[PDB]
Every structure is written in structure tokens, then in C-alpha cells.
Amino acid sequence: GRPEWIWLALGTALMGLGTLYFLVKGMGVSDPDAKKFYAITTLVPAIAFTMYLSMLLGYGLTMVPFGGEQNPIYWARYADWLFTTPLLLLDLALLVDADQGTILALVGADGIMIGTGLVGALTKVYSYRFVWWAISTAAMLYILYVLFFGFTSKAESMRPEVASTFKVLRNVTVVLWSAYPVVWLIGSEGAGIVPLNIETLLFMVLDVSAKVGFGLILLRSR
Amino acid sequence: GRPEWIWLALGTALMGLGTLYFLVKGMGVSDPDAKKFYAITTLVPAIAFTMYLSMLLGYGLTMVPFGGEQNPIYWARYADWLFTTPLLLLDLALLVDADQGTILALVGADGIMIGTGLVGALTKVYSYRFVWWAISTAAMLYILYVLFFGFTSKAESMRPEVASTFKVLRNVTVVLWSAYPVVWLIGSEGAGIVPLNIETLLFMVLDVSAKVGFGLILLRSR
Amino acid sequence: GRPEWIWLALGTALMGLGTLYFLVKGMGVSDPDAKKFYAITTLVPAIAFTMYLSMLLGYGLTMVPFGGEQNPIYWARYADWLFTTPLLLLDLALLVDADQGTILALVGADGIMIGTGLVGALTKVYSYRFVWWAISTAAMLYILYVLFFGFTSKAESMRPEVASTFKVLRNVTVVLWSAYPVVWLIGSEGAGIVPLNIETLLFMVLDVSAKVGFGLILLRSR
Numbered sequence: 001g002r003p004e005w006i007w008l009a010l011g012t013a014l015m016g017l018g019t020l021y022f023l024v025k026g027m028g029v030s031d032p033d034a035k036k037f038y039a040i041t042t043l044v045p046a047i048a049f050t051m052y053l054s055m056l057l058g059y060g061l062t063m064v065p066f067g068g069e070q071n072p073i074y075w076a077r078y079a080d081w082l083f084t085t086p087l088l089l090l091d092l093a094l095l096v097d098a099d100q101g102t103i104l105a106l107v108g109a110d111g112i113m114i115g116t117g118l119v120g121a122l123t124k125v126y127s128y129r130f131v132w133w134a135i136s137t138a139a140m141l142y143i144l145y146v147l148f149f150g151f152t153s154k155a156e157s158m159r160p161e162v163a164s165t166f167k168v169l170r171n172v173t174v175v176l177w178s179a180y181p182v183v184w185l186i187g188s189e190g191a192g193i194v195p196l197n198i199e200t201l202l203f204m205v206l207d208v209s210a211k212v213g214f215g216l217i218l219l220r221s222r
Numbered sequence: 223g224r225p226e227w228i229w230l231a232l233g234t235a236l237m238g239l240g241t242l243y244f245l246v247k248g249m250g251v252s253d254p255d256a257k258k259f260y261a262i263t264t265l266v267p268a269i270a271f272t273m274y275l276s277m278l279l280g281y282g283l284t285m286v287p288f289g290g291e292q293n294p295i296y297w298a299r300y301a302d303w304l305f306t307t308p309l310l311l312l313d314l315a316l317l318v319d320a321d322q323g324t325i326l327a328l329v330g331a332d333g334i335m336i337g338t339g340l341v342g343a344l345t346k347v348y349s350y351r352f353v354w355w356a357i358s359t360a361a362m363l364y365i366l367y368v369l370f371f372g373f374t375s376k377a378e379s380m381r382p383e384v385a386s387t388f389k390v391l392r393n394v395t396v397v398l399w400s401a402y403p404v405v406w407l408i409g410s411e412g413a414g415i416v417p418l419n420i421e422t423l424l425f426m427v428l429d430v431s432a433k434v435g436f437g438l439i440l441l442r443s444r
Numbered sequence: 445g446r447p448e449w450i451w452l453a454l455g456t457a458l459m460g461l462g463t464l465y466f467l468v469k470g471m472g473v474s475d476p477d478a479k480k481f482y483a484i485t486t487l488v489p490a491i492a493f494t495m496y497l498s499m500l501l502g503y504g505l506t507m508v509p510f511g512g513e514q515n516p517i518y519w520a521r522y523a524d525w526l527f528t529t530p531l532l533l534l535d536l537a538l539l540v541d542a543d544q545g546t547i548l549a550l551v552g553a554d555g556i557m558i559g560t561g562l563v564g565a566l567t568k569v570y571s572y573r574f575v576w577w578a579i580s581t582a583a584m585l586y587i588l589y590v591l592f593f594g595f596t597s598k599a600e601s602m603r604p605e606v607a608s609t610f611k612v613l614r615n616v617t618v619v620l621w622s623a624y625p626v627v628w629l630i631g632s633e634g635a636g637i638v639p640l641n642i643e644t645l646l647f648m649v650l651d652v653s654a655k656v657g658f659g660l661i662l663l664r665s666r
């Protein structure tokens with residue numbers, strides 16, 4: 001019996017309707033600037049949608065063995081997180097014209113975080129995961145950093161409005177994101193403390209508040 | 223016995239010789255503009271070539287079960303279509319200087335179409351495929367649309383020649399492309415109406431007339 | 445027993461410390477030009493690092509059968525080479541402002557080389573590999589070429605210093621790179637001449653002298 005069905009039966013709707021919501025509202029008035037934007041942000045919840053639906057249907061659920069059991073690992077998790085994250089980081093650096101340097105970097109720093117996440121997310125040695133967990137977090141903290149001391153531009157010739165619009169998402173990333181290693185850590189694959197049911201939910205409120213909500217928190221603003 | 227061998231033994235040659243044909247002819251005279259082009263278009267048939275060869279050799283053929291049989295699904299199909307499609311859409315939007323907005327969008331709209339194609343292209347529930355088929359088509363129709371009402375620029379300061387060169391491919395995409403969901407639909411994995419042999423052929427005439435021919439239909443023109 | 449452990453236990457350190465070395469030294473003084481650079485080059489050894497670590501731990505080792513045995517094929521090899529190569533080619537074409545034409549081309553020409561490498565790197569017919577080996581090399585020789593007669597710009601309005609800095613890496617790529625088909629050829633999957641132990645080492649001196657060293661051979665210079 002799969003009782004994660006409901007928390008996973010609810011991330012399709014939310015993410016899915018979130019997309020069906022940005023096109024409708026999506027258009028460009030005088031500067032095909034928001035145009036680049038209005039796009040990205042639709043992609044983020046849309047891509048995810050196939051994933052929540054992909055977990056939801058029972059297709060993204062393997063049964064890897066940690067010397068003592070045979071547990072579930074929704075591999076289709078890192079997949080959705082694989083294409084959304086570099087898209088958000090783009091909504092970011094874009095807004096805050098961020099030298100391509102921190103850009104190519106920004107992403108790769110991302111990429112390598114999820115990938116390794118994946119590796120340590122399927123390994124059959126109860127003691128080889130966690131190490132991979134280090135390198136991943138380790139890396140996370142690198143974008144996170146560059147995101148602070150980093151994207152702190154030289155707000156001089158720009159919209160004396162961005163600031164907030166920026167730091168309000170810049171504060172929603174540092175908080176919302178930093179939660180993943182923490183759950184993944186003790187979830188269904190970390191310590192075996194919190195089992196899937198609750199984790200999986202901990203995971204969707206973490207997602208939505210990160211996408212559906214995110215994009216709004218921005219496109220409503222200039 | 224594999225009698226799809228011949229229709230699949232012929233897509234290597236066509237696609238393969240099609241490549242060996244664009245480099246030879248490929249060069250740039252006054253504007254490294256066609257340069258960006260002459261490139262893309264070589265990639266399209268070349269990438270494909272490894273794929274027709276990859277199917278052709280018997281390496282891209284799985285045996286997924288639809289509660290009642292055990293049928294073949296050339297997974298190496300969505301692979302070739304995974305990198306060619308975003309390349310063509312580029313030959314397009316390029317030619318028709320198309321705001322990066324419709325661009326990043328164009329592709330992702332593509333991407334998600336093939337990916338999901340893949341998912342519903344390997345699933346073991348005779349009733350979970352088709353749904354995925356919806357989301358894929360559903361999406362197709364989104365680029366298709368933006369391709370019409372969409373790429374209809376403001377032909378003002380440009381080559382009063384593009385138009386045709388454009389709408390002739392723009393008419394070759396809307397027709398040739400829209401055939402895939404229709405075959406995949408009843409092919410060897412849809413309904414089990416048309417078996418592989420014929421499908422596979424339906425599939426290669428669909429491909430070539432889409433690449434070998436395509437690129438020509440363009441680079442011959444200015 | 446795995447005696448490749450040491451040669452693979454040493455590529456983590458080298459590549460790993462090589463990264464920990466470019467950030468530290470990595471910064472931008474007057475032109476966020478080196479900025480684009482200082483980035484790429486950190487990625488190259490870093491990405492690799494997870495891979496040497498991924499081989500090193502025993503996670504990237506399959507057991508494919510060549511009609512007569514059951515041999516090892518560190519599939520996690522083409523993975524690291526999948527993202528580093530298009531990054532180096534970028535350190536290159538960048539430095540030598542290289543029309544996007546040769547650029548998009550440069551990479552795809554790369555991409556298809558490793559991919560096919562992979563295909564012929566896992567196939568279970570002792571006689572179908574080598575063919576794939578052809579198409580791969582075949583392709584290699586295409587970037588290699590464009591790298592010579594090709595990137596030979598029109599050194600006119602530029603740093604009368606690049607030249608060397610260029611041809612010294614341009615000479616380190618043509619030599620160091622061209623060795624892979626040659627080892628892969630007779631290694632543990634080609635002819636079965638040189639077994640893993642030595643190959644694997646032949647392979648890491650080939651790597652480092654290609655990355656750790658590479659990047660240095662450049663960023664030290666202007």
C-alpha cells in the first residue's frame with residue numbers, strides 16, 4: 001500500500017495549476033525583458049509537474065538496499081530538481097545583471113550539487129551515502145555564499161525598486177533551500193528517522209513555497 | 223528474426239550521407255551568419271546518424287511488458303529526437319530573429335514533449351501510457367502555435383526574400399511533425415494496430431523529409 | 445580484489461586539490477573577462493573530482509560480456525569526460541575569439557565523440573564495439589583539425605602575447621588528447637592487451653596533465 005499517494009497526489013495539482021496560471025497571465029508590454037522572464041518561470045513549475053505526476057504514478061520508485069533493509073528512493077526527485085534549479089538561479093542573476101562569471105559558475109556549482117545528490121541517493125552501502133551528502137551540501141553553500149556577499153551589486157543606475165523584490169526572494173532561497181539537506185539527511189534515506197509519508201510532505205511544502213509561490217513573489221512585482 | 227532491419231538499414235545511409243554532404247558544401251563567404259547555420263544543420267543529420275545506426279545494430283531495442291504481451295520499444299528513438307528538435311527550432315527562430323523569450327520557451331516546450339514521450343514510451347501499465355501521450359502532444363501544440371501567430375514578425379527592415387524561405391519550412395514543420403503522435407499513437411506501442419515493420423518505415427520517411435531534405439530546403443536558399 | 449584502487453585513489457586527490465586551488469587564487473581585477481575564465485577552469489577539475497571519487501568507491505564499475513569473458517568497464521569515465529571537454533574547448537575558442545559557428549560545431553563534434561565512445565563502451569558483441577570506435581575517433585579528428593588550420597585567426601589587433609599562451613595549450617591538446625583512442629583501443633575493452641591496472645594509470649596521467657596542469661598552463665599567463 002502506498003500512503004504517500006496523497007501528498008504526492010497534491011503536488012501535481014499545485015504545480016500543474018501554477019503553470020496553467022503563468023501563461024494566461026504571461027505577456028510582454030514594452031520591453032521583451034520580462035519576456036525572458038515570464039518564460040523561465042513557467043518552465044519551472046511545468047517541468048516539475050511531469051515529475052510530481054511521475055512520482056505520483058509509481059514510476060519513479062526504486063528499491064535500493066542499505067545492508068539491512070530494502071528501501072524506497074524516488075529517483076524522479078533529483079530529476080525535477082535537476083532542471084528547475086538552474087532556471088531559478090537564472091531568474092535571479094538575470095534580474096540582478098550578474099556577470100556570466102558568477103553565472104556559468106552559479107549553475108555548475110548547482111549542477112554538481114544535485115548530481116552527487118543523486119549518486120549518494122542510490123548507493124547500496126549504508127556508509128558511502130553521507131560522504132556524497134557532504135560534497136553536495138558543501139557545494140550548495142558555495143552558491144548560497146555568492147548569493148549574499150556576492151550578488152550585492154552596486155545598486156547605482158538601477159530601479160531603486162529591485163532591492164526589495166530581490167532580497168525578498170534572496171531571503172526565500174536561503175531559507176527554503178537550506179532545508180533539503182536537513183530532511184534528505186534523516187528522511188527515508190538518511191537516518192530512517194522520519195519515514196516517507198511525512199518526509200514526502202515536508203518535501204512538497206518545500207517545493208511549492210519554492211516555485212508556485214516564488215514566481216508569484218516576483219512577476220507581481222516589477 | 224528482425225525484419226525492420228531494412229527500413230532501419232536505410233536511415234543510416236540517408237542521414238549519414240546527408241551529413242557528409244553539408245560539410246563539403248559548408249563554408250562562409252561574407253557574413254559568419256550562415257556560419258552559425260551551416261553548423262546547426264550538419265549536426266541534425268549527423269547526431270541522428272549514430273541513432274539510426276544505434277537502432278540498426280540492435281542496441282536500442284528493449285522488451286517492455288503491457289499486461290498481455292512483451293513488446294519492442296526502440297528507446298534509441300527519443301534520444302535522436304532529443305537533440306535534433308531543439309536544433310531545428312534554432313535554425314528557425316534564428317532565421318526569424320526570435321526574441322530569446324519565445325526561444326528559451328520554444329525549446330523547453332520541446333524538451334518536455336520528448337521527455338514525457340519517453341516516459342509514456344517505456345511504462346509497464348497498458349493504461350498509463352496514453353495519459354503521458356496527452357501531455358506530450360498537448361505541449362507540441364504549444365510550439366506549433368507560437369510558430370504561427372507567433373513567429374509572424376513585422377517583416378519590415380528585412381530580406382523581402384525570407385518570407386517564402388520561412389513559410390516553406392514553417393509549412394514543412396507543421397505538417398511533417400504533427401504526424402508523430404499519430405503513428406506513435408497506433409504504432410507498436412499505441413494500439414498495436416500497425417506493427418513495427420510498417421511503422422518504422424512510416425517513421426524514417428518522416429525523419430528524412432524532416433532533416434536531409436529540410437536543411438537543403440534552406441541552405442540552397444539565401 | 446581491486447588493485448586499480450591506488451591509481452584511482454590518486455586521481456581524487458590531484459583533481460580535488462587542483463580545484464581547491466583555483467578558487468583560492470580565483471579573482472577578477474579590471475576586466476570580468478578572466479572572470480568567465482577563472483570559472484570554467486575550476487569546473488573542469490571539480491566535476492572530474494566527483495568522478496574519480498565515483499570510480500574510486502566502486503560505484504562506476506559494470507560487468508559487460510564480450511562473448512568469451514565478463515569484463516569491467518568504468519562507465520563513470522565517459523561521464524566526467526562528457527562535461528569537461530566542452531568546457532576546455534571553451535577556454536580555447538574563448539581566448540581565441542572563435543565565431544560561434546566553429547563554436548556550436550566544436551562542441552557537438554565533441555559531444556558525439558564521447559557519446560558514441562560510451563555506446564561502443566558498453567556493447568555486448570565483441571565485434572560491434574570497434575566500429576563505434578571509428579565514428580568516435582573519426583569525429584575527434586574533426587575538432588582537432590579545426591583546431592589547427594582552424595583557430596589560426598588573423599592575429600592583428602590583439603595581445604601579441606596570446607599566440608604562445610595559445611599554441612602551448614593548442615599543442616598540449618593535440619598531443620595529450622590523441623592518446624585516448626590509442627589506450628581505450630587496447631586497454632581493458634579494446635584488445636585485452638594492457639589490463640586495467642596499467643591502463644587506468646595510463647589514463648590518470650593523461651587526465652591530470654590535461655586539467656590540473658592545463659588550467660595552470662593558462663591562468664598563470666595573461
Ligand SMILES: COP(=O)(O)OC[C@H](O)COP(=O)(O)OC[C@@H](COCC[C@@H](C)CCCC(C)CCCC(C)CCCC(C)C)OCC[C@@H](C)CCC[C@H](C)CCC[C@@H](C)CCCC(C)C
Nearest residue numbers: 001002003004005006007008009010011012013014015017
Ligand atoms: C486502499 O488500501 P490501502 O492502500 O491499505 O489504504 C490507503 C488509503 O487510500 C490512504 O488514505 P485514507 O485512509 O485517508 O483514505 C483515502 C482517501 C479517501 O478519499 C478518496 C478521494 C481522493 C481520490 C480525492 C483526492 C483529492 C486531491 C488530492 C485534489 C486536490 C486539488 C484541489 C481541488 C485544490 C486546488 C484548488 C484550490 C486552491 C481551490 O483519503 C484522502 C482524501 C482527502 C484528503 C481529500 C480531500 C481534500 C483535498 C485537500 C481537496 C480536494 C477536494 C475536491 C473534491 C475539491 C474541493 C476543493 C476546492 C475546489 C473547494
Ligand SMILES: COP(=O)(O)OC[C@H](O)COP(=O)(O)OC[C@@H](COCC[C@@H](C)CCCC(C)CCCC(C)CCCC(C)C)OCC[C@@H](C)CCC[C@H](C)CCC[C@@H](C)CCCC(C)C
Nearest residue numbers: 107108111112115116118119122487491506519523526527
Ligand atoms: C535485485 O537488486 P540488485 O540487482 O541486486 O541491485 C542492483 C540495482 O538495483 C541496479 O544496478 P546498479 O547498482 O549497477 O545501478 C547503477 C545505476 C545508477 O546510475 C545512474 C546515473 C547517475 C548516477 C548519473 C547522473 C549525474 C551525473 C552525470 C553527475 C555530474 C553532472 C554535472 C556536474 C553536470 C553539470 C555541469 C555544468 C557545467 C553543465 O546505473 C548505472 C548506469 C550505466 C550502466 C550506464 C551509463 C551512464 C550514463 C547513462 C551516462 C552519463 C549521463 C549523464 C549526463 C546523466 C544525465 C544528468 C546529468 C547532466 C546531471
Ligand SMILES: COP(=O)(O)OC[C@H](O)COP(=O)(O)OC[C@@H](COCC[C@@H](C)CCCC(C)CCCC(C)CCCC(C)C)OCC[C@@H](C)CCC[C@H](C)CCC[C@@H](C)CCCC(C)C
Nearest residue numbers: 014163164165168172204205208209212213214216217221
Ligand atoms: C523593502 O520594503 P517592502 O515592504 O518589501 O516594499 C516593496 C513592496 O511592499 C513590494 O511587495 P512584496 O512582494 O515584497 O510583499 C511582501 C512579500 C513577503 O514575502 C513573503 C514570502 C512567503 C513565501 C512567506 C510568508 C510567511 C512569513 C513572512 C512569516 C515568517 C514565519 C514562518 C516562516 C513560520 C514559522 C512556523 C513554523 C513552526 C513552521 O510578498 C508577499 C507575497 C505572498 C503572499 C505570495 C504567495 C505565496 C504562497 C505561500 C504560495 C502560492 C501557491 C500555493 C497554493 C501553494 C502552496 C500552499 C501550501 C502547500 C502551503
Ligand SMILES: COP(=O)(O)OC[C@H](O)COP(=O)(O)OC[C@@H](COCC[C@@H](C)CCCC(C)CCCC(C)CCCC(C)C)OCC[C@@H](C)CCC[C@H](C)CCC[C@@H](C)CCCC(C)C
Nearest residue numbers: 223224225226227228229230231232233234235236237239
Ligand atoms: C534470414 O532469416 P530471417 O531473419 O527469418 O529473414 C529476414 C530477411 O533477411 C528479410 O528480407 P527479405 O526476405 O526481402 O531478404 C533480405 C534482403 C536480401 O538482400 C540482401 C542484401 C542487403 C544486405 C543489401 C541492402 C542495401 C541497403 C539498405 C543500402 C541503400 C543505400 C544506397 C546505395 C542508396 C543511396 C544512394 C542513392 C541516392 C544513389 O532483401 C532486402 C534487400 C533489398 C531491398 C536491397 C536493394 C535496394 C536498395 C534500396 C538500394 C541498395 C543497392 C546497392 C547494391 C547499390 C545500388 C543503388 C544506387 C547507387 C544505384
Ligand SMILES: COP(=O)(O)OC[C@H](O)COP(=O)(O)OC[C@@H](COCC[C@@H](C)CCCC(C)CCCC(C)CCCC(C)C)OCC[C@@H](C)CCC[C@H](C)CCC[C@@H](C)CCCC(C)C
Nearest residue numbers: 043047062075079082083329330333334337338340341344
Ligand atoms: C524482466 O523484466 P523486468 O525486470 O520485470 O522489468 C523491469 C524493466 O525491464 C527495467 O526496470 P524499471 O521498470 O525500474 O526501468 C526504469 C528506467 C526508466 O527511466 C529512464 C529515464 C527517463 C524516463 C528520463 C529522461 C527524461 C526526463 C529527465 C524528463 C524531463 C526533461 C526536461 C523537461 C529537460 C528540458 C528542459 C529545458 C528547460 C532545458 O530507469 C530508471 C532509472 C533510475 C534507477 C536512475 C536515475 C535517473 C536518471 C539517470 C537521472 C535523470 C537524468 C535526465 C537529465 C535524463 C537525460 C535526458 C533529458 C535531459 C531529457
Ligand SMILES: COP(=O)(O)OC[C@H](O)COP(=O)(O)OC[C@@H](COCC[C@@H](C)CCCC(C)CCCC(C)CCCC(C)C)OCC[C@@H](C)CCC[C@H](C)CCC[C@@H](C)CCCC(C)C
Nearest residue numbers: 236385386387390394426427430431434435436438439443
Ligand atoms: C513564395 O514563392 P516562391 O515560389 O517560394 O519563391 C521563392 C523561390 O521559388 C525559392 O524556392 P523554394 O525552396 O521555395 O522552392 C519550392 C520548395 C517547395 O518545398 C517542397 C517541400 C518537399 C519536402 C515536399 C514536396 C511535395 C509537394 C509540395 C506536393 C504535395 C502533396 C503530398 C504531400 C503527397 C500526398 C500523397 C500521400 C498519399 C502520401 O522547395 C523545393 C525543394 C525540394 C525538391 C527539396 C528536396 C527534398 C527531398 C524529399 C529529401 C532529400 C533527401 C532524400 C534522398 C531522403 C528521403 C527520400 C525518400 C525516403 C522519400
Ligand SMILES: COP(=O)(O)OC[C@H](O)COP(=O)(O)OC[C@@H](COCC[C@@H](C)CCCC(C)CCCC(C)CCCC(C)C)OCC[C@@H](C)CCC[C@H](C)CCC[C@@H](C)CCCC(C)C
Nearest residue numbers: 445446447448449450451452453454455456457458459461
Ligand atoms: C587486501 O587484499 P588484496 O585486495 O588481495 O590486495 C590489494 C592491495 O591492497 C594492493 O596494493 P599493495 O600490495 O602495494 O598494498 C596496499 C598499500 C599499502 O598502503 C596502505 C596505505 C594507503 C591507504 C595510503 C594511500 C595514500 C594516497 C593514495 C594519497 C596521495 C595524496 C598526497 C598526500 C600527495 C598530494 C600532495 C603532494 C603534491 C605533496 O600499498 C599502496 C600504498 C602507497 C603507494 C602509498 C604512499 C605514496 C603516495 C604517492 C603518497 C601518499 C603518502 C601520505 C601518507 C603523505 C606523504 C606525501 C607528501 C605530503 C609529503
Ligand SMILES: COP(=O)(O)OC[C@H](O)COP(=O)(O)OC[C@@H](COCC[C@@H](C)CCCC(C)CCCC(C)CCCC(C)C)OCC[C@@H](C)CCC[C@H](C)CCC[C@@H](C)CCCC(C)C
Nearest residue numbers: 265269284297301304305551552555556559560562563566
Ligand atoms: C546479467 O547480465 P545481463 O542482464 O544478461 O546483461 C544486460 C546488461 O547488463 C544491462 O541491460 P542492456 O544491455 O539493455 O543495457 C543498455 C543500457 C545502455 O544505455 C546507456 C545510455 C547511453 C548509451 C546514451 C548516452 C549518450 C547519447 C544520448 C548519444 C548522443 C549525444 C549527443 C550527440 C549530444 C551532444 C549534442 C550537442 C549538439 C548538444 O541502457 C539502456 C537504457 C534505456 C532502457 C532507457 C532510456 C534511454 C536514456 C535514459 C535516454 C537518453 C538520455 C541522453 C540525453 C543521455 C545523457 C548524456 C548525453 C547528453 C551524452
Ligand SMILES: COP(=O)(O)OC[C@H](O)COP(=O)(O)OC[C@@H](COCC[C@@H](C)CCCC(C)CCCC(C)CCCC(C)C)OCC[C@@H](C)CCC[C@H](C)CCC[C@@H](C)CCCC(C)C
Nearest residue numbers: 458607608609612616648649652653656657658660661665
Ligand atoms: C613563444 O615563446 P615562449 O617561451 O612560450 O614565451 C612566453 C612565456 O615564456 C610564457 O610561458 P609558458 O607558459 O609558455 O612556459 C612554457 C610552458 C611549456 O609547457 C609545457 C607543458 C607540460 C605539460 C609538459 C612538459 C614536458 C616537455 C615540454 C618535454 C617533452 C618530452 C615528453 C613529452 C616526454 C617523453 C617521454 C616518454 C617516454 C613518456 O609552460 C611550462 C609550465 C608547466 C611547468 C606547468 C605544470 C604542469 C604539471 C605537469 C601538472 C600539475 C599538477 C600535478 C601535481 C598533476 C600530475 C602529476 C603526475 C601524475 C605527472
Ligand SMILES: *C/C=C(C)/C=C/C=C(C)/C=C/C1=C(C)CCCC1(C)C
Nearest residue numbers: 081084117136137140177180181184
Ligand atoms: C524546485 C526545487 C528546488 C529548489 C530544489 C532544491 C534542492 C536542494 C537544494 C537539494 C539539496 C540536496 C543536498 C544538499 C544534499 C542531498 C541531496 C539534496 C538534493 C536533497
Ligand SMILES: *C/C=C(C)/C=C/C=C(C)/C=C/C1=C(C)CCCC1(C)C
Nearest residue numbers: 303306339358359362399402403406
Ligand atoms: C528529426 C526528428 C524530429 C523532428 C522528431 C519529432 C518528433 C515529434 C514531434 C514527436 C512527438 C511525440 C508526441 C507528441 C507524443 C508521443 C511521442 C512522440 C515523441 C512521438
Ligand SMILES: *C/C=C(C)/C=C/C=C(C)/C=C/C1=C(C)CCCC1(C)C
Nearest residue numbers: 525528561580581584621624625628
Ligand atoms: C579531461 C578529459 C579529457 C580531455 C578526455 C578526453 C577524451 C577523449 C579525447 C576520448 C576519446 C575516445 C575516442 C576517440 C574513442 C573511444 C572512446 C574515447 C572516449 C576514449
